Amino acid sequence: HIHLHVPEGATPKDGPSAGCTIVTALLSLAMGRPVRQNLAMTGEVSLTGKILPVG
Amino acid sequence: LRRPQDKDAKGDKDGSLEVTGQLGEVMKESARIAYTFARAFLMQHAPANDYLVTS
């Protein structure tokens, strides 16, 4: 079990658009490698790693 | 405390919090956050104790 938190401030439609980071969080938490420093990222994903556009 | 703690040495269920004091919701999620973090700090700090998870 893993508690998770994403800070509020995004408009609701943007909620999913952050989602691509979540898996990265999961992966870094899982495998344990810290993610590479100074590397932002964003975008939505459609249930199998395909990426989608965002405004 | 809400129930006697050592009901079973072998038990495994969340030691559920009960928030009270006419909380606004934002405070409730923050409480959940602090709750989990405290429980983490314990296992990180004094692993032998289990008083939080077990009650």
Side-chain angles (χ1 to χ4, degrees), chain A residues 3 5, chain B residues 33 36:
Chain A
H3 193 122
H5 175 34
Chain B
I33 290 162
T36 311

Side-chain angles (χ1 to χ4, degrees), chain A residues 13-52:
Chain A
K13 79 195 66 45
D14 301 335
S17 51
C20 188
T21 189
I22 299 163
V23 292
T24 318
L26 267 68
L27 269 293
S28 167
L29 173 51
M31 183 272 286
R33 258 187 74 189
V35 63
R36 205 271 289 281
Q37 282 57 10
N38 296 114
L39 188 158
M41 55 78 71
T42 181
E44 191 278 334
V45 177
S46 162
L47 195 151
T48 176
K50 206 73 184 312
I51 308 288
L52 273 70

Side-chain angles (χ1 to χ4, degrees), chain B residues 23-31:
Chain B
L23 277 296
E25 60 85 18
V26 191
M27 283 67 76
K28 285 193 284 292
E29 294 85 5
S30 61

